[PDB]
Each structure stands twice: as structure tokens, then as C-alpha cells.
Amino acid sequence: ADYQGKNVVIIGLGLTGLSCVDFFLARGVTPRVMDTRMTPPGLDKLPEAVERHTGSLNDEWLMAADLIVASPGIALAHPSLSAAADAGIEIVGDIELFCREAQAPIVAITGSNGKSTVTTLVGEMAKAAGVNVGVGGNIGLPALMLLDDECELYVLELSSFQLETTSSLQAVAATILNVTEDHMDRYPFGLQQYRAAKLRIYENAKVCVVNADDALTMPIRERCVSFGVNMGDYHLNHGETWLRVKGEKVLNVKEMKLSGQHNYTNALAALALADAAGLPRASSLKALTTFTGLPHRFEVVLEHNGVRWINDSKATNVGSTEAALNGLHVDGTLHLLLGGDGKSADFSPLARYLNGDNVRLYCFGRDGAQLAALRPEVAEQTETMEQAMRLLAPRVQPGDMVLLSPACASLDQFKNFEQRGNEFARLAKELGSH
Numbered sequence: 468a469d470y471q472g473k474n475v476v477i478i479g480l481g482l483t484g485l486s487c488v489d490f491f492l493a494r495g496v497t498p499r500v501m502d503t504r505m506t507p508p509g510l511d512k513l514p515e516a517v518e519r520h521t522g523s524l525n526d527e528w529l530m531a532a533d534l535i536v537a538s539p540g541i542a543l544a545h546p547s548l549s550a551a552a553d554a555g556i557e558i559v560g561d562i563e564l565f566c567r568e569a570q571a572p573i574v575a576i577t578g579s580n581g582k583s584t585v586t587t588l589v590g591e592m593a594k595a596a597g598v599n600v601g602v603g604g605n606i607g608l609p610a611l612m613l614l615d616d617e618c619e620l621y622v623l624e625l626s627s628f629q630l631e632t633t634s635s636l637q638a639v640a641a642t643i644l645n646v647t648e649d650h651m652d653r654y655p656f657g658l659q660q661y662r663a664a665k666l667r668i669y670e671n672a673k674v675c676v677v678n679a680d681d682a683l684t685m686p687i688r689e690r691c692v693s694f695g696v697n698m699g700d701y702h703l704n705h706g707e708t709w710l711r712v713k714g715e716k717v718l719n720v721k722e723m724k725l726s727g728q729h730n731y732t733n734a735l736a737a738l739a740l741a742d743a744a745g746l747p748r749a750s751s752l753k754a755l756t757t758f759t760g761l762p763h764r765f766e767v768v769l770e771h772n773g774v775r776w777i778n779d780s781k782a783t784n785v786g787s788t789e790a791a792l793n794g795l796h797v798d799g800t801l802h803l804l805l806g807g808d809g810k811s812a813d814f815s816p817l818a819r820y821l822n823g824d825n826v827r828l829y830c831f832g833r834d835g836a837q838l839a840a841l842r843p844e845v846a847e848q849t850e851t852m853e854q855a856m857r858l859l860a861p862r863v864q865p866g867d868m869v870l871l872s873p874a875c876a877s878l879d880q881f882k883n884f885e886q887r888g889n890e891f892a893r894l895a896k897e898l899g900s901h
């Protein structure tokens with residue numbers, strides 16, 4: 468692609484928007500930037516020569532554009548964007564721009580749960596092979612900050628929103644890890660529309676990797692490689708669990724630092740991707756044994772006085788909290804923090820994990836009331852996570868677990884789930900010691 472001379476408008480600042488701004492400038496193009504927020508993140512970092520419009524979308528700017536670059540945070544269904552599309556104005560996102568420039572194979576990963584873990588795992592596999600890899604996308608660095616002629620492989624986490632605006636990805640290996648209800652605030656045609664967005668990832672992919680246990684990850688119409696628990700090209704053989712490929716044992720999971728069936732299927736998906744990308748097995752399997760987990764993803768931030776305080780702030784949907792609760796061992800009482808922006812999710816599937824005598828709920832943020840409703844008898848509701856932590860802290864006994872696994876976005880009260888996890892860890896440290 469060639470952008471010289473074009474009228475380019477970027478919709479949405481934050482970090483993604485900023486990376487787009489730099490992309491265009493380096494290429495001799497001064498874009499304009501708009502954001503529906505009066506004061507968006509990154510504004511103070513915007514180059515002074517860049518024209519900006521905040522507090523709404525500017526239709527004069529949109530309808531004048533040769534190219535619109537939409538942040539994943541704005542819906543293509545927004546009436547102004549819909550209008551520009553109707554006019555035949557080209558709309559892309561940061562990932563589209565990256566793909567048109569990228570000169571190394573791309574491993575592309577999406578899914579409702581596990582995508583950041585799998586993305587990071589594949590990155591560590593490439594690093595163990597001595598491959599110069601750039602890892603990011605919807606996790607870590609925005610994709611455009613990774614772009615480098617010296618890069619030998621790219622491993623990108625791609626959200627459903629990023630995928631909606633991308634058409635030029637031809638991944639060496641692509642996966643949808645799973646599809647569970649999420650982002651319903653952005654998909655008014657429901658779960659299948661959300662699935663359709665993720666299914667785009669397989670288009671022109673050299674190898675597709677599907678979850679044998681989730682039919683929604685499969686292309687609607689060679690086959691795909693698959694992973695799964697009891698079935699799959701990559702599967703588990705099971706007081707001991709092994710990773711297997713076509714019936715052959717490849718790793719006893721006692722060698723991994725991650726635990727739980729969820730993380731073992733993540734290991735399988737990552738190995739399938741690594742394999743398809745042509746990475747050596749030895750180094751891929753080595754990476755599985757060294758990887759410690761991501762911050763905010765079922766992270767023990769404090770284990771003190773017989774109490775484990777776990778930061779699972781990255782659980783921003785129901786399937787993610789289910790993953791934390793399913794098979795969870797707690798010696799005494801589970802003090803479970805739920806809340807924030809539920810994105811119109813149905814929280815009911817959580818109820819079956821919440822029976823019996825040793826569960827307490829502390830529900831906060833926008834949808835705290837809806838979460839308390841799961842089992843009002845063991846539930847407290849507060850406005851903030853800090854209030855819930857101060858409420859629960861005195862009730863904590865040796866043997867208890869305090870788990871932030873909110874099943875919601877943090878965006879009603881926090882900058883992002885990382886700020887939420889960091890605040891929880893701060894409070895855990897204060898409240899979990901005498």
C-alpha cells in the first residue's frame with residue numbers, strides 16, 4: 468500500500484491510536500485524529516502538528532477522508548462510520564496496516580479466553596529457538612510498534628474488534644481458541660455475529676488450528692489442525708497428565724509451571740501453532756517448562772498467614788471466571804470479587820460454581836447488583852473494589868482464598884484490567900498483613 472498524499476483520519480487515540488499516528492508520520496503523511504471522548508488517553512502525547520477533534524466524531528473530516536483508521540474501541544456500526552462505509556470510504560484498523568507492511572510470517576491468535584497466554588507462550592517458544600520474534604497486538608505493544616525488517620516472526624493477539632477491520636492477514640498459523648459470550652455490548656446480532664468476527668482470522672491462513680471441544684471455533688464451511696482434552700491432533704493423556712501429538716507423548720505437565728486443564732489446552736494450542744510456524748520442538752517444549760504466567764492471570768500476589776490473594780483481573784468475561792472456578796480447590800472460604808462493566812453478559816453460568824457453605828461474593832462497579840443476584844444470600848454489594856476489599860479483609864481466615872476474578876471489564880472505574888489488578892495487589896498487601 469501507498470498512503471502519500473491521502474487524507475487520513477484516525478478514530479480513537481489511546482495507545483493504538485498513537486501508534487497509528489507515528490506510522491503515518493514516518494511515512495510522510497500527517498493524519499487527523501478524532502475521538503468521541505473529550506479527553507482521550509494519549510492526547511498530551513499527540514504531536515503538536517497533528518490536527519485533532521475531540522468529544523464527538525467530525526463528519527466533515529470523515530466524509531473528506533481517503534482512508535479511515537478505526538480504533539478497535541469504536542464500533543463499525545457507529546452511524547458516522549456506517550455512513551462513511553456506505554460512501555465507499557475505505558476503513559481499516561492498525562492490524563490491517565501492520566499486515567500490509569509485515570515481512571515475516573504471522574502467527575495469529577484470538578478467542579474469548581486464553582489468547583494472551585497462548586500468544587505469550589508462542590513468543591517464548593520462538594525465543595527459545597533463537598528466533599528474533601515480535602510479540603504483541605491486543606497484548607503488550609500495539610502491532611505497529613513491532614514492525615521491523617529484522618523481525619523473523621510475529622506473534623499477535625488479535626481481538627474480535629481488530630479482526631473486523633482486517634482483510635490482508637494471511638497467517639502462517641491462526642487459531643480461535645474458544646468462543647464464549649463476550650462483547651455483547653458491541654454485537655447486537657449476538658453470539659454468532661461475535662463468532663463471525665473471529666472466524667475472519669482463518670481467511671488465507673496457511674494452517675488453521677481449532678478447538679475440538681468448541682464447535683464455534685471451526686470454520687463454518689484441507690481440514691484444520693485441532694487440539695482438545697480427550698480428542699484432537701493435540702490432546703491430553705491422563706494422577707498425571709501428558710501433552711500428546713497424534714498419540715505420541717511430548718510432555719509430562721509436571722514439568723510446566725502452569726497448572727490446570729485450561730493451561731494444558733493452552734499449551735497444546737501454542738504447540739500446534741509453533742509447529743505450524745516451523746519452530747523446533749525441543750525449544751518449544753523447553754519454553755513450556757520455563758513460562759511462569761502473565762500478570763493479572765490467576766496471579767498469586769500474596770500468600771501470607773494461611774491466605775492466598777489471587778489477582779485474576781484479566782478475567783473480563785464469564786468463561787474466564789468459569790476457568791478460574793472450575794475445579795478450584797479452596798481449604799476454607801472463597802471470598803470472590805465480582806464486578807465492573809458486564810458488557811450485557813448473562814452471568815447465570817457462574818451460579819453452578821457458587822453453591823454450598825464456603826463461598827462469599829463481593830460485588831461492585833456498574834453491574835454489581837446483577838452479580839449479587841447470583842446468590843444474594845452469600846453476597847455483599849459495594850460501589851468500588853476498594854470498598855469490597857476493606858469489607859472482606861476482616862472476614863478472611865487462615866485457609867481462605869481471596870479471588871479477584873470479576874467476569875467483567877474494568878473500564879467503568881479503571882483505565883484497564885491491569886490498573887484494576889495492580890490496585891487489588893496494592894490492597895492485598897495492605898490488608899493481608901497485621
Ligand SMILES: N#Cc1ccc(COc2ccc3cc(S(=O)(=O)N[C@H](CCC(=O)O)C(=O)O)ccc3c2)c(F)c1
Binds near residue numbers: 503504538626650876
Ligand atoms: N473514538 C473513539 C473511542 C475509542 C475508544 C473509546 C473507549 O475505549 C474502549 C472501550 C472498550 C474497549 C474494549 C476493548 S476490548 O474489548 O478489546 N478489551 C476489553 C478490556 C477490558 C479491560 O481492560 O478491563 C474487554 O475485553 O472487555 C479494548 C479497548 C476498548 C476501548 C471511546 F470511548 C471512544
